[PDB]
Design a protein around this ligand. Sequence first.
Ligand SMILES: Cc1ccc2c(=O)c3cccc(CC(=O)O)c3oc2c1C
Ligand SMILES: Cc1ccc2c(=O)c3cccc(CC(=O)O)c3oc2c1C
Lengths: 182, 182
Amino acid sequence: SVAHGLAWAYYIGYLRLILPELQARIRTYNQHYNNLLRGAVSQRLYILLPLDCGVPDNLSMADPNIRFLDKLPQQTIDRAGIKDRVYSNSIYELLENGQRAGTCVLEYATPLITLFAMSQYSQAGFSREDRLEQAKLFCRTLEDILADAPESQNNCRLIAYQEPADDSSFSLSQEVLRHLRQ
Amino acid sequence: SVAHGLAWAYYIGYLRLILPELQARIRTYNQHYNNLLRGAVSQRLYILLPLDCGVPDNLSMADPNIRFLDKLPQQTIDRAGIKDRVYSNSIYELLENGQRAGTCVLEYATPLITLFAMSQYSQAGFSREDRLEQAKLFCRTLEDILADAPESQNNCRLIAYQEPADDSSFSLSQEVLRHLRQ
Ligand SMILES: Cc1ccc2c(=O)c3cccc(CC(=O)O)c3oc2c1C
Ligand SMILES: Cc1ccc2c(=O)c3cccc(CC(=O)O)c3oc2c1C
């Protein structure tokens, strides 16, 4: 199964690398730019999982109620298969009814890009129906990995959603706010 | 298939983001530091694919006839799912009888880390035998992808190899040089 392997790859090649020092990075940021923030970023990493596998080029453009505010200070990673790579995470403001309702570190799950690409390329032998099935499977597998994972406790949140196409009353910031509220 | 999706993920999420500007980065290196390197690094990316999926902490330590020389100039990435990310590549010295015999951009394919991990974790439901079969299928699938991929014509080379178990005296250094010499 591609989703099974993708979930493990996403965990092994990203999440178990980024999550250990994430809560430290967020506390550090909440220390030094506190005068600037007049608030506090939340502790967890919020990962967007659109089931249609539609990943935009820029998250800032994706919803007018989600707004880029700041970068976390970087993290260079020193491991096998990874040498001197610079990882950065972005911090977003979430608006509700014109007002700031939350601030969190937020990003899309990259393997959805691969699932989407696989459905476009004929050499991959992957249909658009295969795609939705695999995306749900990817979400559930990853969910299960993180439940039992030493690195993943209390510091990572999966936000999976299906977007109606295309009455489009959907709000991405509403969906994130629903998880943030806890 | 796990390998099928890992190969596509490696192409979609690394190789096609890195290959397009590789030669230019190398060409550019062969100038600014031509006086420092006193030679030339070859222009392709050499990807090591150990079938036993053993990927070392430091390649430099996998064979002592493989020594780290220098880093390439950095590339920043502007794609979807990957804003403000800094990628570097490494140049290695290959030794033969104590002297330099070649210079190349060299790295292990990361999905083999994932294949290895999956064989170690119960939750992955993935055996040692599953691992070797999938590693072979990964190489074949990746080959097929690169053969017809726009970004991957003539700037990439796969070095798949199987370590004998009888003699613990196989030479990665020599294997890489065997490809290099053409
Ligand atoms: C741009 C892009 C696209 C797809 C993947 C991916 O499938 C994928 C799968 C497993 C692990 C990674 C590593 C990462 O998210 O940095 C992956 O990264 C991808 C990236 C960076
Ligand atoms: C450290 C590590 C381990 C495993 C993968 C991986 O499986 C994997 C699979 C597909 C794509 C990527 C992205 C990359 O190699 O930068 C992947 O990256 C990994 C990395 C960076």
